[PDB]
Amino acid sequence: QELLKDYIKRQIEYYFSVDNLERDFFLRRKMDADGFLPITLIASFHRVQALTTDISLIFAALKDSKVVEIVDEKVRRREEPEKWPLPP
RNA sequence: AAAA
Numbered sequence: 660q661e662l663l664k665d666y667i668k669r670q671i672e673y674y675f676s677v678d679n680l681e682r683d684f685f686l687r688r689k690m691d692a693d694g695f696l697p698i699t700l701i702a703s704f705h706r707v708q709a710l711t712t713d714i715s716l717i718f719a720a721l722k723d724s725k726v727v728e729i730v731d732e733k734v735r736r737r738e739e740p741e742k743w744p745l746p747p
Numbered sequence: 748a749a750a751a
Contacts, residue, residue, distance in 0.1 A: 685751045
């Protein structure tokens with residue numbers, strides 16, 4: 660599933676890009692104070708769900724990333740994640 | 748779901 664994993668990885672990395680985060684108020688409101696978001700929330704986003712509903716594949720796509728980091732069931736931008744959370 |  661390497662090709663599909665690459666598309667998934669790059670799609671999710673876009674959500675965690677600075678360009679997207681500057682405008683993505685929904686994503687920032689779902690962040691905890693340390694910037695973490697449930698991976699299953701990301702899995703529900705339409706462009707990811709179109710590609711797969713296989714949660715292990717999504718996890719595998721994200722371990723291959725230099726943009727995001729995973730802790731247990733959550734994911735955040737590696738660089739200055741505390742910059743981004745917003746009040747509900 | 749203006750790539751939430």
